[PDB]
Every structure is written in structure tokens, then in C-alpha cells.
Amino acid sequence: EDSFVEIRM
Amino acid sequence: EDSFVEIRMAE
Amino acid sequence: SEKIAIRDFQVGDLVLIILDERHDNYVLFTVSPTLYFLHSESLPALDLKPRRPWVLGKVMEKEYCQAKKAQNRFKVPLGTKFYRVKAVSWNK
Amino acid sequence: SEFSRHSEKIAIRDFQVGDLVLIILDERHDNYVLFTVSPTLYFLHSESLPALDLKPWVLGKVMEKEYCQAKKAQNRFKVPLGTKFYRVKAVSWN
Ligand SMILES: [Cl-]
Ligand SMILES: [Cl-]
Ligand SMILES: [Cl-]
Ligand SMILES: [Cl-]
């Protein structure tokens, strides 16, 4: 949503 | 005891 | 017969999903220090949103995330790297 | 640095010696049991409690199992008469 993001494995 | 007893699959 | 995975989770694993009061979220039971949060979308089909303390599930997808604000819905520290998984019902 | 590893998995039915198991308190039967998806009850032998420090839930390893049958409606396991069940000895898994 806004307080966290997807990152690269 | 005799509350419960050992059993096994028959062979 | 299937067995419950306890770490290094992948899609298709049978997993144990437990309520984590500290983090106000359902998580995957695990022996690793790494957190696997159950995606919000998964809760209704799992009968975990009207709570029930546990349920068996099967991982259907898995996402690597990082908390960018100190306040977040996962109650984890700023910068924490964690996984979010979607799971569905499993039965024998 | 990246590394690969084997991981044990928790058995949930048809338990065997050496299985990794989840040991939980069954309030309904006043006993610790193995977490299972199947109808058969696997009760933790009372001898196993002190070394698990149960003398909530524990990971354990099955060491012995015994198939049993209740011969009295009133028993320590709170199972109906004629119920067939297992007693398991297990040690902790840390
Ligand atoms: Cl903040
Ligand atoms: Cl950050
Ligand atoms: Cl392991
Ligand atoms: Cl006993």
C-alpha cells in the first residue's frame, strides 16, 4: 500500500 | 491397569 | 502424505497459519527469525475475518517486502524485510 | 551470504518414529497430543512430559509409539469405550 514496498528477491 | 490395553494389527 | 513446512517457504507448501498478537497479524508458523505475514486478501476465504487462533493453509504466492515507515500495519521496525504470502484453505 | 539448506517438515498423520511433530495441549482430552488432521488421537506419554518441560505447544521428535484401545468408558484420556488410540514418547526438537 504505502508504508511498505515490494523489493527484489 | 486394565483401563486400556495394547493392541496391534493382526498378522 | 503432505507435511507442514516450517521455513524457507515456497508456493505450494502446506503451512500453519497462527495469530501473532505482537504484530496484530496472522503469520506463518516458522522456526526462522524471518516474518511471513498472511496477506489481508486471504483472510475471508480462510474463515479468519468475522479470532480463530490457527488454520492450515497452502501457499499460493509469496512477496518480498520492506517496511519504509516506522509505523506500519505489520508493527515491524523501519527497514524490516519480510515476506507476505497469500494462502488458501487446505483439507486432507 | 546466500546458502542452501535442508529443512525437516512437520508430520500431521500416521506418525512414525523419527517424525517431527507438533505437541499441543488437548483440553478436551486433558492431555498433550500430537497435532494431526486425522481422526486418530496420538497422546503424549506421561513419561515424556518432564524433559519437554511440561512435567502451550512444542516441536518434538517421535521416539516410540504404542497402539492402544480403551476398555472402560471412564479413562484418563476421556475417550469413549472401545476407542483405539496411540501413546507416543517424544523428545524435544530444538
Ligand atoms: Cl512514522
Ligand atoms: Cl528503509
Ligand atoms: Cl530444520
Ligand atoms: Cl500415559
Author numbering:
A (entry chain C): 175 to 183
B (entry chain D): 175 to 185
C (entry chain A): 1493 to 1542, 1551 to 1592
D (entry chain B): 1487 to 1541, 1553 to 1591
Task: Give excerpts from the publication.
Consistently, using quantitative fluorescence spectroscopy-based assays, we demonstrated that a 13-residue synthetic S177-phosphorylated Optineurin LIR peptide (‘SSEDpSFVEIRMAE’, referred to as p-Optineurin LIR) can directly bind to FIP200 Claw with a Kd value of ~12 μM, which is ~27-fold stronger than that of the un-phosphorylated Optineurin LIR peptide (Kd ~307 μM). To further uncover the detailed interaction mode between FIP200 Claw and p-Optineurin LIR, we also determined the high-resolution crystal structure of the FIP200 Claw/p-Optineurin LIR complex. As expected, the structure of the FIP200 Claw/p-Optineurin LIR complex is composed of a symmetric FIP200 Claw dimer and two p-Optineurin LIR molecules, each of which mainly forms a short β-strand and directly packs with the β4-strand of FIP200 Claw domain in an anti-parallel fashion. Particularly, the aromatic side chain of Optineurin F178 occupies the LHP of FIP200 Claw, and forms a unique cation-π interaction with the positively charged FIP200 R1584 residue. Meanwhile, the hydrophobic side chains of V179 and I181 pack against the aliphatic side chain of K1568 and the SHG of FIP200, respectively. Moreover, the backbone groups of phosphorylated S177 (p-S177), V179, and I181 form four strong backbone hydrogen bonds with the K1568, Q1566, and Y1564 residues of FIP200. Similar to that of p-CCPG1 FIR2 in binding to FIP200 Claw, the highly positively charged K1569 and R1573 residues decorated around the LHP of FIP200 Claw are neutralized by three negatively charged E175, D176, and p-S177 residues from p-Optineurin LIR. However, in contrast to that of p-CCPG1 FIR2, the phosphate group of the acidic p-S177 preceding the crucial hydrophobic residue that occupies the LHP of FIP200 Claw is coupled with the FIP200 R1573 residue by forming two specific salt bridges and one hydrogen bond, while the side-chain carboxyl group of Optineurin D176 forms a salt bridge with the side chain of K1569 from FIP200.
